[PDB]
Amino acid sequence: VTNEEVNQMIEDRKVDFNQNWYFKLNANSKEAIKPDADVSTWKKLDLPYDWSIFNDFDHESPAQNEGGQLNGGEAWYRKTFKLDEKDLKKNVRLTFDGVYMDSQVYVNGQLVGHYPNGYNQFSYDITKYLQKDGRENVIAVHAVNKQPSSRWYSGSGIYRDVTLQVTDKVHVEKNGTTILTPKLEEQQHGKVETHVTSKIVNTDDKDHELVAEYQIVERGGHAVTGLVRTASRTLKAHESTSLDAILEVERPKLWTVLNDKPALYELITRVYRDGQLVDAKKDLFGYRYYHWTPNEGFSLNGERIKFHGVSLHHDHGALGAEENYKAEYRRLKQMKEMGVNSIRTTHNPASEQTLQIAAELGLLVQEEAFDTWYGGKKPYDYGRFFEKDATHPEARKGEKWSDFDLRTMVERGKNNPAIFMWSIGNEIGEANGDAHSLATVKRLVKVIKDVDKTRYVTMGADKFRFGNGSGGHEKIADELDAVGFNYSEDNYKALRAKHPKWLIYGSETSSATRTRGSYYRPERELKHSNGPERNYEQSDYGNDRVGWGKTATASWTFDRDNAGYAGQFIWTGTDYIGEPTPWHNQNQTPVKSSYFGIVDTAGIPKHDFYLYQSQWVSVKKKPMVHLLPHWNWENKELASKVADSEGKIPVRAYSNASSVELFLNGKSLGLKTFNKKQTSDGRTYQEGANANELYLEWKVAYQPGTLEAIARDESGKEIARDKITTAGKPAAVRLIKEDHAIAADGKDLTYIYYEIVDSQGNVVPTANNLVRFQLHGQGQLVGVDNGEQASRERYKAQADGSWIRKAFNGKGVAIVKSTEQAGKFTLTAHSDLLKSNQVTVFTGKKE
């Protein structure tokens, strides 16, 4: 057997099962299951598919605007498939990355399983339900989203990938590989012992003789070991065993967040039955170590870092709940451009895409199992299943759904270098230190530790922000490895004095609210300002925050000033559908999406993105300067809110540079210098006129034209510019390509921005013009967005098949997915009385 053949076997082991499904909302259960159903009345599609995202907004929706005002319901999905002749005796497993929710899977008329969880991955061995002789089988999936189930937009149905594993009767079982590097800090400059465990099952009714062979390789690289073999032993029929080996890898490269292409490795497993290669598998992993102390916080590979982190919902804007590798890559790559090193998957398990991209980009991950325990937060959420018996075929005796779901998530991610924290709850009210909650936290911690001891078990708790933060809930925190504070910076000092051994971080911070390109009262701090005068908008100066919240500056400066507060996960990294605080559940208002994000649903940064970048990215890696606001102040209503007593517009610069000099129409308004300072522990930092300003400010009398900012190093040498220009009346639509080409695989996509521009090419920053889109060629329009919270516009096509969307504050995005045919597609944009534009994107070979 050649290495070529082994790799093919690995590749053939797992396939994409997303293709050729039929969908019908409210379909008849008996017809969906039955062998030769009439599917003329069904919709033929490829997964993932979120059915909720094609709905219109409904002011009367049971989801309410916390759930995006997009309705759920019930639906069936249907696939028919035949095993190849070679595969007839093989074991067949079906994996669903996420189905929301309350699902039932039927194979040839029989119920394989019921699975409540809407975010956790699950698989079924469906071998026994398959027809003999290679006759076609029918798989039918029932998904139910009965509202309200969610405190944010969930979507409905099969929003994540479905995959099929076809294997020998003797095979490495699902989630069966464990890779550990116990002595890595010690052995790192020499040979590092890599302990691998394999969990092999014999589904045959004959006994077979078993050997495992292991090799490690650099991902997209060379081998770093030879073949290492376990001793031959008998595996009895219908039994499973665990195999072990140690492999030595010399001076491996350590996975870190300190570069954007961190080192990854792959374990190759070969399984022999009676001396014949019958199974082959690869498992992604990395070499990293970390430590965390109460007063010094966190270090990765001996380097002290803070969690510069974001909370993220799953949700892709116009894509709705449909997960996509390219969409998630763009979101995460962009987070990383800001200086983010850490994401929290709030509040639910992550997709395979998110976990993989995080390993690929160098982002530390906290994956969260639960938004509630046994109490519940919404009637149709998970709370009702939490203590009920798992009915999964492969559930262990006495396992509750919470037990089974937590276990399986940890087994799925135990080898992923990115994950360093497992969260067993967010804002669990019932976790107050009573006997029941105390029992429950211990049970849950123990589930994890029976699988994985290497990662921090944690929770995100807002109980610490009430009063002095102390209470029976402190007893629950005692059971955790690390204790997450939600919005509790005010009680940290006291809580820290009380619990000197606690490892503390901000599990949820800020909740500042902003609308891109919208400005209000920069001079004030606005607390939960949801009045009619706000016009359903919040300020991009970043001076709006909810009642329990903090601004970016307040929340970041605190984190920065305290070593024992290890970092934070800001709410939120990007906008999501739903939860439109400060207009939460005011359902007759137009708001349907969040204000919390640093970036809007359209992927377009708000100004605070640049504030964070100035703080988190070194001037060596990326010198920058960013100006706000815009320079169009002709409109008196707009200006009356921004301009001060003398009618000057406060202009502000974010920079990681030493100084910024602002020019109006070529004339200097003065050079200003950041004040340099040190943390009590000697970390160096920069700030402005005072401790509450991380920016430089100029009060500028409004003269139309150009503002330009020159950023300089200490030598007085220019390292960065930014520039803002007054726009004229809209003259045209401009389309901006992110990608010159994408892959022709039917999965890759591109984001093209549309701007409303004047005759000189300046973006009109106030423009809300409606744009109509045409697509020709080898592509599929799959979304449109402008990020605006108060918009009730379709994200998808209109009822007549049209694609339209307004600009909001000059900008928006359109999303095009590739087909499986190489060639090109062209996007033309039109707006009324404006010039049109087109860009062409090529589709073809990959990478």
Numbering used by the authors: 138 to 984
Which statements did the authors publish about this structure?
BgaA is specific for galactose β-1,4-linked to glucose or GlcNAc [lactose or N-acetyllactosamine (LacNAc) motifs, respectively] found in glycoconjugates. The N-terminal region of BgaA comprising amino acid residues 138–993 has amino acid sequence identity with GH family 2 enzymes. Through detailed structural and functional analyses the molecular basis for the catalytic specificity of BgaA is defined and this activity is demonstrated as critical for the ability of pneumococci to utilize complex N-linked glycans as a carbon source and protect the bacterium from opsonophagocytic killing. Further analyses also revealed the presence of non-catalytic CBMs within the C-terminal region of BgaA that mediate adherence to host cell surface LacNAc and/or lactose.
The X-ray crystal structures of a catalytically active fragment of BgaA was determined to 2.7 Å resolution (data not shown) and an inactive Glu645Gln nucleophile mutant in complex with unhydrolyzed LacNAc to 2.2 Å resolution. This polypeptide had five distinct domains, four with immunoglobulin (Ig)-like folds that are arranged to create a nest in which the central (α/β)8-barrel domain III sits. The positions of the nucleophile and catalytic acid, Glu645 and Glu564, respectively, in BgaA are conserved with the analogous residues Glu537 and Glu461 of LacZ. Notably, however, there was no evidence of bound metals in the active site of BgaA. Consistent with this, the activity of our catalytic region construct displayed no sensitivity to the presence or absence of metal ions (data not shown).
